Amino acid sequence: PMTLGYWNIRGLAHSIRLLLEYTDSSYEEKKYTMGDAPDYDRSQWLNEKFKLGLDFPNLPYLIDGTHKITQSNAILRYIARKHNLCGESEKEQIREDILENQFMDSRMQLAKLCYDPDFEKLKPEYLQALPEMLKLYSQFLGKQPWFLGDKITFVDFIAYDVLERNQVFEPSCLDAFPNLKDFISRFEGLEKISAYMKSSRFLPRPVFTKMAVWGNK
Amino acid sequence: PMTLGYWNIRGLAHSIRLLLEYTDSSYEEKKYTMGDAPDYDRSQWLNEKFKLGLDFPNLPYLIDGTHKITQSNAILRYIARKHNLCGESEKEQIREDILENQFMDSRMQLAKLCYDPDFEKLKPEYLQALPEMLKLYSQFLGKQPWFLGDKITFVDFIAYDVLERNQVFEPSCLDAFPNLKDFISRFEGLEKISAYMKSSRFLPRPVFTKMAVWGNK
Ligand SMILES: CSC[C@H](NC(=O)CC[C@H](N)C(=O)O)C(=O)NCC(=O)O
Ligand SMILES: CSC[C@H](NC(=O)CC[C@H](N)C(=O)O)C(=O)NCC(=O)O
């Protein structure tokens, strides 16, 4: 079985976990636990960090026998290639590359906020900009079932994580955007995703690490 | 001709500029200028930000006729595909995806620091970590001329920007790492790269925007 190493949270493994489940991948999780405050003791990871034979040791990581992979997008692409869940044409590849990076910027905006000591002061401005961020995603998806079009690919798994987690942050945020709401349902309704989400494994919380101001538990 | 839009700085356009020059691409630059302090007035960009027909308006952008591309990695991949400067095999693609995301983490570390108000206090800790960062890049490159092996690809262009800019931040940083120094020379010695670097277009500073503590000019 493949090994997926990450913190015992949602974080950056969510899309990877879902993709692994969707693709019916044989895998098990190496789950590291961060200590509490004031420590935020990381030693579980730190001890074996340099022992896994990763070129750029990091969480998350994927071990698939010969292949040892860090960087969450690289893991996602790796698995997506293995199961034909990639953009094929130029137009699709362009769309894929734009989305992967754009979603990453959006992911990180929410993380920057929720780790910021000034969370309470900063929250409103983020919610001001929130509709415009969703609007661009909505326009882009249009009437298509999936972000690259007819066929589901890896970005849809990124898409879901970042869009859904906004909906856990601000529950009403997708209300203006019916196609994004339908996207969420489509995704969660997928036979394997649905089965997973009802299983003991599913790990939708905590969103962030114990160091977070919001979503630490 | 393609249009490359960005601020009148090095920033995230460097690798793109160099790739466009290397590939002998027909291109011209739409250069936006940020105001000074206290304003940092952005209105040059802001006015026509929503008028270029980009799905996710952003700097940098590439307009290639039908194709309008934002996100710097997306732009790089776009041009790389057009000129066969991509990882072909699985092992290459894995390496490419790892490196693109890793370098981007590294890039952002320097940017976080150089935009931080506590730049002076924070600088030493970054320089503490700096050798280990370089070491992992060095090990990964090994004896190969380019990061993916025999043939140069797009990551090399990212590689150059982030590694070189560290050498502008701390000039001695590559001294313990001869293969990285040779990488820099190999890259700078490429016929078209060399010609470009000696031309009037070449824009190696400022490193960051006027809002930066380090490398604003
Ligand atoms: C909050 S996510 C946990 C964090 N990992 C990253 O930041 C990886 C980000 C990377 N860009 C990726 O996408 O994999 C981490 O603990 N990394 C290992 C480390 O710092 O030693
Ligand atoms: C300091 S670079 C300038 C900054 N752009 C980005 O942060 C884009 C980053 C994106 N991840 C990319 O790589 O293109 C910017 O001015 N963006 C347009 C805007 O904010 O309106």
Curated annotation (Swiss-Prot), chains A, B:
Residues 89-207 form the GST C-terminal domain. Gene3D superfamilies: 1.20.1050.10, Glutaredoxin (3.40.30.10). Its EC number is 2.5.1.18. InterPro entries: Glutathione-S-Trfase_C-like, Glutathione-S-Trfase_C_sf, Glutathione_S-Trfase, Glutathione_S-Trfase_N, GST_C, GST_mu, GST_superfamily, Thioredoxin-like_sf. Residues 1-87 form the GST N-terminal domain. It catalyses: RX + glutathione = an S-substituted glutathione + a halide anion + H(+); 11(S)-hydroxy-14(S),15(S)-epoxy-(5Z,8Z,12E)-eicosatrienoate + glutathione = (11S,15S)-dihydroxy-14(R)-S-glutathionyl-(5Z,8Z,12E)-eicosatrienoate. GO terms for cellular component: cytoplasm; cytosol; extracellular exosome; intercellular bridge; sarcoplasmic reticulum. Muscle. The keyword RNA-binding does not apply. GO terms for molecular function: calcium channel inhibitor activity; enzyme binding; fatty acid binding; glutathione binding; glutathione peroxidase activity; glutathione transferase activity; protein homodimerization activity; transmembrane transporter binding. GO terms for biological process: cellular detoxification of nitrogen compound; cellular response to caffeine; glutathione metabolic process; hepoxilin biosynthetic process; linoleic acid metabolic process; nitrobenzene metabolic process; regulation of cardiac muscle contraction by regulation of the release of sequestered calcium ion; regulation of release of sequestered calcium ion into cytosol by sarcoplasmic reticulum. It is found in: Cytoplasm. It is an enzyme of class 2 (transferase). Glutathione binds at residues 6-7, 42-45, 49, 58-59, 71-72. Substrate binds at residue 115. It comes from the Eukaryota. The record marks 209 as: Important for substrate specificity. The modification Phosphoserine is found at residues 26, 43. Belongs to the GST superfamily. Mu family. Homodimer. Conjugation of reduced glutathione to a wide number of exogenous and endogenous hydrophobic electrophiles. Participates in the formation of novel hepoxilin regioisomers. This is Glutathione S-transferase Mu 2. The lineage of its organism: Eukaryota, Metazoa, Chordata, Craniata, Vertebrata.
